[PDB]
Amino acid sequence: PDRAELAELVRRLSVVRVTLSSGREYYVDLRRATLHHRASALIGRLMRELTADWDYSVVGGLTLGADPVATAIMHAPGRPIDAFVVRKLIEGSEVTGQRVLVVEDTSTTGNSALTAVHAVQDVGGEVVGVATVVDRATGAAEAIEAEGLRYRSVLGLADLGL
Amino acid sequence: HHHHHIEGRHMAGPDRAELAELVRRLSVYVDLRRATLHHRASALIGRLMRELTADWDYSVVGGLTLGADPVATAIMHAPGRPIDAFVVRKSARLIEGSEVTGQRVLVVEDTSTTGNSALTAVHAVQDVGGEVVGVATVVDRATGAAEAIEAEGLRYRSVLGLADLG
Ligand SMILES: O=P(O)(O)OC[C@H]1O[C@H](OP(=O)(O)OP(=O)(O)O)[C@H](O)[C@@H]1O
Ligand SMILES: O=P(O)(O)OC[C@H]1O[C@H](OP(=O)(O)OP(=O)(O)O)[C@H](O)[C@@H]1O
């Protein structure tokens, strides 16, 4: 019900003929939903449920995509979880000595979320897993699991109705 | 110091004094991000900035990344009428998130020093046809930012002042 409402809002808000960054070939603009009053609340609530079995006190990722996902999780009802942001180094709550959830809005390569995992690691945080709003079946899952980390997402590529 | 009026004085109560506590503890020698990205302080920030700006008409809230962002999302997530958010990039789209064109907008900032960051976000919004109804900050530090904001004919309001920070 929530997941269905979220998926509808994402197709509606974020699946927007286009010359890409690539030079190739709709495109997905996840920030239209992560910065939307309702979608962002659903994101916060579903991401908590998605990672309930994990142990972490602090959530964040690489600016900019990850930031409203992290704060949406911090604000959504439930137990206290603080937030941070990785610049391009760490801002917001202390991750040093901490259990950290790394988030992304949607990964392509996983580089961004990884840059974020390593920036956390290089200052002493322990990363427990990576969670994203939308997986797009692009290899990010695989790249992330190739460093010992669990990867999960709320929605998959099917939910985008492509 | 160039002391400016702190409109947040008038909404005294438990929420304001708790937040002032949290900002002294987490942020003071001053790192506001520790409060803006903190679960309780951010939630109070959302509640209070909504209250501070209740007589203002806007449907979207945001400012210049990074400082503005957790203040904007805090407002968006707090209880009450639906308010969406956006983020002005330092460079690029330039404005990311919800649509601001033809909208009434609140620009926010965690704390301003010169006012340059907030005025940058304001101008970026105007340039894409958004209407900025004011600027609100969490903490004013009597630095002259409020005057620079007001010199363009914008309204300005803050929740806390220097005195709330010790
Ligand atoms: O790094 P990858 O796993 O390939 O992911 C592609 C990235 O593209 C977007 O961020 P973008 O590069 O647009 O930067 P922004 O977050 O500053 O907009 C999105 O948030 C992804 O993190
Ligand atoms: O003189 P002003 O333009 O009013 O600037 C005041 C800003 O300075 C600080 O951030 P900082 O610029 O250090 O970091 P950021 O740009 O990454 O938010 C603070 O968070 C305010 O946003």
Residue numbers in the entry:
A (entry chain A): 4 to 19, 22 to 30, 33 to 95, 105 to 178
B (entry chain B): -9 to 18, 34 to 97, 104 to 177
Per the authors:
The fifth step in the de novo biosynthetic pathway is catalyzed by the enzyme orotate phosphoribosyltransfrase that synthesises orotidine 5′-monophosphate (OMP) and pyrophosphate from α-D-5-phosphoribosyl-1-pyrophosphate (PRPP) and orotate (OA). Herein, we report the X-ray crystal structures of MtOPRT (coded by the rv0382c gene) in complex with PRPP, inorganic phosphate and an exogenous Fe(III) dicitrate molecule (ferric dicitrate, FDC) at 2.25 Å, 1.90 Å and 2.40 Å resolution, respectively. In all the structures herein described, both monomers composing the functional homodimeric unit are related by a 2-fold axis, with a solvent excluded surface between monomers of 1045 Å2 (13% of each subunit surface).
